[PDB]
Structure formats: structure tokens, C-alpha cells
Amino acid sequence: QNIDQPTEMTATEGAIVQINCTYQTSGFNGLFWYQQHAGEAPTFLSYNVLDGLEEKGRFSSFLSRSKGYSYLLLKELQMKDSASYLCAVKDSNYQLIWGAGTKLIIKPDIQNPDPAVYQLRDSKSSDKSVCLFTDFDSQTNVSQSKDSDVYITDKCVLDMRSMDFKSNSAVAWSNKSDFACANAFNNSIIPEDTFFPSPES
Amino acid sequence: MRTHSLRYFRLGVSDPIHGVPEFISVGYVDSHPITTYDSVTRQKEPRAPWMAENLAPDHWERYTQLLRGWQQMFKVELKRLQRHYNHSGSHTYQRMIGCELLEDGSTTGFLQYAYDGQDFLIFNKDTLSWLAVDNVAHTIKQAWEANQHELLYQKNWLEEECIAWLKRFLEYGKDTLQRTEPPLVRVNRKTALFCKAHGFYPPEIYMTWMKNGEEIVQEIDYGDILPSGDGTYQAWASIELDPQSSNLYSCHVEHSGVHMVLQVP
Amino acid sequence: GVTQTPKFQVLKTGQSMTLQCAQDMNHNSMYWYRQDPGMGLRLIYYSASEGTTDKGEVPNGYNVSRLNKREFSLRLESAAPSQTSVYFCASSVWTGEGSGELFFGEGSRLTVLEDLKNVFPPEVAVFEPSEAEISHTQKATLVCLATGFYPDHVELSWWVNGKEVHSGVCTDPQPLKEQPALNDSRYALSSRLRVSATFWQNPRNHFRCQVQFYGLSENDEWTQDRAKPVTQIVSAEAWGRA
Amino acid sequence: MIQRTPKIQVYSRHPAENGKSNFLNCYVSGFHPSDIEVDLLKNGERIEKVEHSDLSFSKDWSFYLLYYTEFTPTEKDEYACRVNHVTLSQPKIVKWDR
Ligand SMILES: O=C(O)CCNC(=O)c1cc(=O)[nH]c(=O)[nH]1
16 A cells, blocks of 8 residues: 655745645545644645545645545645645555655745845854855755865745745854855855955954 | 345444343345444454455454444444433434445445434435434434535445445355355145245345236235245245136246246146 | 643663653544654554554554543653654544544654763854844844754744744754764754844844753763753853944 | 334245254344344244344344254144244244144
8 A cells, every 4th residue: 555745845935836645545535635844743634535626725635536646736825835745545444544745845935135145243152153145036055065064054934024024044154264154155056146245354 | 247235234222231232233245244243242253254264354353443433433322312312211223334236337325324223314425415304313414414524435435435345245255145046936825826936046036926917916915035044045925816716827936037937727 | 632742852772751642622532653754654553442542553662551531641661763753642533433634742752872972962152143234134134053962852942132032033944964974963953033233233132042952861871971961951142232 | 112023934944844854944023122032942842952143134224033943843743933022012922834
């Protein structure tokens, strides 16, 4: 018995995504979708057991028993839709067979990109120097460090709710003496127009 | 294939005598018991050799666990019914679910409940609704119909799962279920003519009397189809002789696509 | 709903542990799953009704007890590295309802280790905003770095003027392995808090990053020279700058 | 509340011929509720080695049962089936008619 769904999907804020689930099971007593935010409980989304499409707000779920497949359709994607989506099928013995889940990554719609690499202020309690790559469009990907003494985290989407403003950023740090924000992200393809403020005297 | 059916019954008894189980569930393919479970043994067991022969212990273990839970659910439902009927004493709750695969390949499916041996709720899988016989059933109908997914689960089980199980058991039991043993038929007189048939399988049989080539169903006493204990069946039909006028009577027997006539001289 | 504990637990190979789970939904059926990367949930044990249990797909190494209708505990008699996982308790009205969905607890992250020698709390530092960011964008991003911890059992929060905040925060969803090749690599985690330049420029605005670390307890044996890595909060602060 | 009294039919497995071994059947059917007592009688005396099927279920919600024993019929031996049910004031006895 086998349930299959893609490992990961990436789509843009405001668009549509279809998450597929195919199953080969011994008998069929229905298909479930659950949503699971990272670090949180899975919560029930939908149940299908006859053929066709069922809608529930922005989410629809479709089933074809003869093809052995279902999809979960998410319209007008929001950042809060970022989560894994788990498919599960009840077989002839009423056993739930779980798929491995599809992680859905949503790219924010960055309206006024202003890519820049800034040097944060040193902490008197730390030997680290810290660089922030921020405000780039979501097409940019941040690559891992190629120097074992330089640490670079992946891009993160932050939301300033009061200003209705979203921004991407990634952080790089090192205690190496030769470390400079000007070169911290040299292993990534960064925007041509990225702003590198002059370092102090 | 002739027509065949699969069905599961449940029986719950609210205040049983010391010996009696409070819950019993039996499955059948056609007239053949195939599975049993009750609240004394708390185990689901085969009632036909070709079920035990073809389902491994893992299957009986899993269904034993399912039946332990269905038993508790059945008690909870009965307790609710009797409280709402404002009935004291011992009362029964019954369920029957199953399907038929007809000779032409069409299918039927059914699900219904009884209280004290009388219809209580009847599922209509085409309109996805429950028929209620009284206002206690009507309250249940409203609660059950508010759970639309469970109605859909039941329709899929009746229409797809049940038919797949039935086809699987029909293959397991092929040498029993798909065989034909023709009837032995004789006419005697006790003044009535008795047309008597025995030795036949499957139990479906049609016996009637014709009087000068016309059938008078009002004049015919039809015996039941009865098990003989060896896996075959017996049956009879009778008509009373007119002592003033002779007539040309003939017994007619139809069984498994063969017709038989016994003209009485 | 469904309440399970503990949220995090580090264990030594051979140690015993009990996870607790309660539900206040008058459900009959309760379940214990494990969730592991690259595979679907796997059922360990369940309890169709008050006063019955039954095995699942992967019961070897585990036991359960249905204490009352509300509670269903999972015990690991002899913890093993392979039992490192996230455990989820769930419940449902009736196991035997066809269409019945599951209600899940929050999850319990267990890490089982051969020895507690590689357990480390995080060091936590806060970095004040770049002045170039402030003049270019009229916004100011603080960064919090929590580095060198193991296992990945941390919760990072920001506090502004004594209240926890979530608006304007982004914390890495996944920790960075500091030495990606090693199986026992210590972890790093970054978080950002972005506020307006005006808010950062108020000298009485106060900023703190706190990291709750889940580590060793009193009964855990400790023999290393460094400090015993107990469960603890590590934090760092910054004040606004006029 | 409707209770249904059992129908009681007594018959041999094969057409009876004195001296040839056979089976005596008592088929008890259409009754509700399910508790019932069934005895086969030889000359008014209960037979000891009596077998019976498990309680069976009809789609009309009534129950049925088959009791039987191996026997060799003779001219002098008179056989009967004795049934008690909540619908019956006293045991009902049905003789084998052949
Ligand atoms: O009813 C349903 O929702 C599903 C089908 N039921 C069964 O598989 C079943 C087995 C049995 O032994 N007895 C009984 O009543 N039912």
C-alpha cells in the first residue's frame, strides 16, 4: 500500500497551487487532507470519498476513485498558507495510510524591492561580525556558505503588520578577521542593484 | 453468475438474561453464515471453511478490534433510543447492511435499523437520506443527516467496498456458492396433491400447480424452502382436489434455469 | 482539545520516559503516532475505548496505558537512538466511524543520545541596527543569534518593553548545522526584529531576545568539566538609541 | 411492542423409510425476540444428542434456528419438537407427521 505526494512545492503569493496525492491501497473508505504548520499540530482540512470537487473557502479538494488520486486546491495564496499538507487514505480495514506530506513554500510579492547588505553593530558581548542581506525580491535565492567559519542562514519573510509591509532577509556572520559584509554573500547570485553602504573609517 | 449478496447483521439487547450476549454480529453470503462475533467471546470468527481457509489471522485480528468498537457504539445508540422511547425493560436494536450483485451485473445496496424487531431507520443511498418511522427515529435522522461525510462514506461502502468484498468471497467459496444440485421432485396425495422437491442447491426454487394449463395462485398452499441439514434444501406446494370433477393437474418446478413438469395422471 | 507533554525531552540510551496526553472532548479513541523526516505518520498504539489498547504499525519499543477516558500515556521503557522523533497524540470520536477525523496534540520532540556529552545550551547575542539601514529605509532591523546549541530544542522570543512581540519578527524555520557534515553538529538559529526608525530612536525603548533551551534535569548524570547543560533561559538585550 | 411467535416445522432430511438412517429436523423461525428453547422428543422423551445451528438473522428482523438429530425411524417411534418462547404460555409441541 502506497501514498505519494510531492516533497515540496513553491508558488507566489496571490496565485493558485494544486497539491496532488495518488494512492494504491487495498480498498478505499475515504481520503483526508490535513494542514500542518511547522512545529504545530496537524489540523483536519477535508474528507472526500465520492468522486468530484468539494469547496471550503479558499481550499477545494477533488477526488477520482478510478484514477486513485486527489488534489487539494489553494486559491489566492497567502503567506499563512505556508505549511506542510498531509494526505491520508483509509483502506478496507479502516487503517489510515499517511503520505509523507508536501511542504508548500510561498514567495511574498515584494512590491518595492530595495536589495542591500548592511553591517549590523557589533555586540560588546560577542566576537561575531553580522551582515544582513535584506529587501530583495523573492526571485533571489541565498546560497549556503562555502567557508566553514562563515555562517549564512536562509532567507526569512518578515511582516510588519502595522505598516502592511513584507521583506525577505538572510543573515551572515563570522568571527574571522577577513570577514566583511561586502563579500559575505559572494556565493549567492544577488541583484545587480544591491546596495552596499560604505564601511566606516 | 446467479444473483448473490453479502450482508452483516448486528443485534443488541438492552437488559439480557444471564446467558445471553448483549451484542451479536453475523455476516452472510447468500444464505451461508460466513463470520460471527459476540460480546461473550469478543472475537470475530469464520463460520465457513472457505473464509478461514483464505483470510489470514491478521484479518480476523483487525476485524475483531473493529467489532469491539462497533459493539460499544451499538450500546450507546440503544441506550439513547430507549431513553427517548421512555421504555423500561429489555429492548432490542438491530442493524443490517449489505449489497447484491445481480445476474445482469447491476448492483443494489442497503442499510437499515430496527428497534424491537420493527423497522426504525432506512437509508436511501440515492437521495442520501434516512427514512424515519416515528419521532424517535426522526431525531436520529436529523443528527445523522447533519454528518454528511458519514452518509457519503456509507454510500461508497455500499456501492464499491461491499461489492468488492462480495466478489472476493464469491471466489473463495466458489465450489459451494456457484454449484448446482437439481431438485428431486415427486407428487403424492394426502384429498390434496403435494408436489415435493428435495436435494436442491441453491435454495431459490419456484414450485406451482397448474390446472388444465392455467395457474390459480389462490388455490395453492406454498410450503417454505427449508434446510435439510446437509447443505441442500426441500420445499413443497399443494392443491386440493375437486371431488366432483376431475382435472388435469401438473406440478411445475423451476430451478437454476431448468424447468420441470410432473403431469398427474 | 488534546494536551500532551512534555514539549521537548533529551534522553540517554537506556533511559525510560513517559509522554502524557489528555483530551477534554469526550472522545472515546486516542492514538500515539511518530513523525519522522521523509515518511508518513506511523501509528504506534491506539485505544479504541476507555479500558482497551491495541498495537499499531510500529509498537516495538513502546507501551501505553489508557488511564481514564481522558488520558492515554506513551512510555518508552528503554530509549534507543532510533526513537528520536516527534511524537503526536491524537483522538477521534470513535475509531470505527468511517469519515471521522483526528484531532492532534501539539507534539513531543524526543532526542535519544548515546551520551549527554554533546548537549550544549545556546549562546545568545543581540546586534543593533545598521545606521545605513536606518537612513536608507527609515526602518531598523535587530538581529538575534543563538549559536552552538544541541540538540535542536529551543524556543526564541523577542520582548519589547517587557512584552513579547511577534509583529515584525522572523525567526529561521530551520536551524543551521554549524558543521553540516557531522551527525552531532551543534546548531545556530537567527532571528530578526524590524521596527520603524522612530521606534528604534526612542532611548527608553528596550529590546530583549530570549531563548528557552530544553536540556538536562537534576537526575541526569553529568561528568564533563564544563557546566551541566540544564534546561535554562539564555538572553541578550539592547536599548534604543537616540 | 410486537413479539412474534415461532413457526415450528418438523421433517426428515431425506424421505423417510423405516429402517434406513436419517436426520430429524426442527426448523424454528420467524420469532422475535431471540431467546428460545428447543427440544426434540422421542415418545415424549427428550433426545440427549441434539445439535443445532447458531442463531440466524432474517432481513425482516426475526430469527431462525435448525435443530436436528440422527435417527432411524420405525413404525412405533413417535417424534416431536418442543419449543418455548416468551410468546407462548406453555411449551408448544409439534409432532413429526409422515
Ligand atoms: O458497516 C459499515 O460501516 C462497514 C461494513 N461493516 C462491516 O465490515 C461489518 C462486519 C461485521 O462483521 N459486522 C458488521 O455489522 N459490519
